[PDB]
Amino acid sequence: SNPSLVIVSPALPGNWRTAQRWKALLSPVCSARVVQQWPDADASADTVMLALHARRSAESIAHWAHAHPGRGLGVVLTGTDLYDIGSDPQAQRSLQLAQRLVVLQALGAEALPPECRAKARVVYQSTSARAELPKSARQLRAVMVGHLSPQTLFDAARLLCGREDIRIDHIGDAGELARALASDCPGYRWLGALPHAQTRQRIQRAHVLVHTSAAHVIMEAVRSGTPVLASRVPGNVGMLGNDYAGYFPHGDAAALAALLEACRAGQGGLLDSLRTQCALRAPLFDPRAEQAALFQLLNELQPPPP
Ligand code: NA
């Protein structure tokens, strides 16, 4: 067992969702609580800290390292901090103060300074599974979930302007650039902001998910039996694997269009290969696995009684 764990998520009312999911997976072995800032009024009881984002939580992190020198500090690199730690002094200070660093995919520790890697640990994110649905051989529907690399998808859709056999469904809140692409191109559609249940059903129902960004969406696709076409950036490669066959160069719309065309051609195949490759990735995103990685991390951070 019963350590008192504090999760720092300084998000304004991504990281909140992770924080809540970690609290639920750790609640069986610890008294877990989420805060925006530490310390608070219940802070004298806390023994272990899991702070999300080396910069946004730096002030909590620094407060923890003063009250608990060499004890209980886990700092989670959520993305933009890892890819901040180049110039940000606070981000850098957070890396040095931590007893443990958490990266969320395999490749994270390569961006970490050399002296910070031994204390890094890989904890893949997790999501619930959806059943893999049968898919038509007569079209290829691609879904992209991403608040408005928007231009990369936009350019690929214009390079495919006449095709109605390749359909691109863009989900996300922004805008007129999207509405224009929707009027001009039969196969592009901007559905705007959609509820979370509808977004996951469309991903489950899509032949493929396209991610051009430089993470939860990729897990939701993989765990719903939907392959992914993704930009070759470390965050994505860490999720899908160094030998994944569905990568496109970041900012290369022609390469993205070619990849959709190749998926379409093998219908009736690259798409079948991508499906097989994603099914081998899916067990990395099992809640059981994330929970187990968290248990071990908590046993490592747990400080001996003062
Ligand atoms: Na508990």
Author numbering: 2 to 14, 19 to 88, 90 to 154, 159 to 184, 190 to 229, 234 to 287, 294 to 331
The paper states:
Here, we report the X-ray crystal structure of SenB, the first known Se-glycosyltransferase that was recently found to be involved in the biosynthesis of the Se-containing metabolite selenoneine. SenB catalyzes C–Se bond formation using selenophosphate and an activated uridine diphosphate sugar as a Se and glycosyl donor, respectively, making it the first known selenosugar synthase and one of only four bona fide C–Se bond-forming enzymes discovered to date. SenB then uses SeP and activated nucleotide sugars as glycosyl donors to form selenosugars through the generation of a C–Se bond. Of the enzymes in this pathway, SenB is especially noteworthy, as its unusual ability to form selenoglycosidic linkages expands the scope of glycosylation reactions in nature and further underlines the notion that it belongs to a new enzyme family annotated as TIGR04348 by the NCBI, for which structures are not yet available.
Our crystal structure, determined to 2.25 Å resolution, reveals that SenB is a type B glycosyltransferase, displaying the prototypical fold with two globular Rossmann-like domains and a catalytic interdomain cleft. Despite a lack of significant sequence homology to any structurally characterized proteins, the overall SenB architecture displays the canonical glycosyltransferase type B (GT-B) fold, consisting of two globular Rossmann-fold domains. Each domain comprises a parallel β-sheet linked to six short α-helices. While the β-sheet of the N-terminal domain (NTD) is comparatively extended to six strands in length, the C-terminal domain (CTD) terminates in a long α-helix, which extends across the entire molecule. The orientation of the two domains forms an electropositive interdomain cleft known to house the active site in other nucleotide sugar-binding glycosyltransferases. Further inspection reveals a second electropositive pocket, ∼20 Å away, that is linked to the putative active site by a positively charged groove. Activity assays confirmed that SenB does not require a divalent metal for activity, and no density was observed for a bound ion. The apparent disorder of SenB’s interdomain cleft in the absence of a substrate (regions of missing electron density indicated by dashed lines) is analogous to that observed for substrate-free MshA, perhaps consistent with catalytically relevant conformational flexibility. By contrast, efforts to obtain a SeP or thiophosphate-bound crystal structure of SenB simply yielded structures lacking ligand density, suggesting that in the absence of a nucleotide sugar, the phosphate group may not bind to the enzyme’s open conformation.
